[PDB]
């Protein structure tokens, strides 16, 4: 089983991103998928969940409204669309994908979001 996110990179704060992973060796479709990030120096956190369906999704409070995730399960993929990005959204981003039994979980390696504060917007 494994799992490769997709996307990743420099926003500049109030922007946007896509973050895509997609997933082989199993079927995931009867499965969770989600999205967690470990910003500098901080424990790791779930950002986003999806039910197998698509039917029920989970945010993390400082992402809700902003965030969004979605999934294409003939794809076997999941996605995080970031809106209105800020520079505390920066970490590394890793996807994770569910199944029955042990290890009940797999992890991509993650992909590093930045998004620059309005310091750097000028040169100055």
């Known amino acids: 089983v494994q799992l490769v996110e997709s996307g990743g990179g420099l926003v500049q704060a109030g922007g946007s991103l896509r973050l895509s992973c997609a997933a082989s060796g199993s079927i995931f479709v009867n499965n969770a998928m989600g999205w967690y990030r470990q910003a500098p120096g901080k424990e790791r956190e779930l950002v986003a969940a999806?039910?197998?369906?698509?039917?029920?999704?989970y945010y993390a409070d400082s992402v809700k409204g902003r965030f969004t995730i979605s999934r294409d399960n003939a794809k076997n993929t999941v996605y995080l669309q970031m809106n209105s990005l800020k520079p505390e959204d920066t970490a590394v981003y890793y996807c994770?994908?569910?199944?029955?039994?042990?290890?009940?979980?797999?992890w991509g390696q993650g992909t590093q979001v930045t998004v620059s504060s309005l310091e750097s917007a000028w040169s100055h």
């Open positions: 994770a994908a569910d199944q029955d039994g042990y290890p009940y979980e797999y």
């Open positions: 999806i039910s197998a369906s698509g039917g029920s999704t």
